[PDB]
């Protein structure tokens, strides 16, 4: 059991952007590190080629520099009796 307890990452908001925004959905678990079953609405999370989604030792977190189109919508984390709720109304100026 260590005391490094990071700064709550888990976002809980609606917040807007444009297109190729930088949006930031992380998820870091301080306490039983348990896996994390994360999903985002129009982004299928694969390799790290399309989108930058990182594996961290401890949790896993969702950086996606480029919020665009399709990555417009809503995102669900089912932690371990923890969530994450972020709404990102992105924009279209670009592609």
């Given at each position: ?60 977190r ?6 665009g ?22 924009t279209?100026?670009?592609?």
């Amino acid at each position: 059991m260590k005391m490094m307890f990071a700064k709550e990452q888990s976002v809980h908001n609606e917040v807007q952007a444009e297109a190729g925004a930088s949006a930031m959905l992380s998820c870091e678990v301080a306490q039983a590190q348990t896996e994390v079953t994360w999903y985002k609405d129009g982004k299928k999370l694969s390799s790290s080629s399309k989108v930058g989604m990182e594996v961290k030792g401890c949790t896993r977190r969702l950086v996606l520099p480029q919020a665009g189109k399709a990555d417009a919508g809503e995102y669900s984390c089912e932690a371990g009796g923890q969530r994450v709720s972020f709404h990102l109304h992105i924009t279209e100026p670009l592609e």
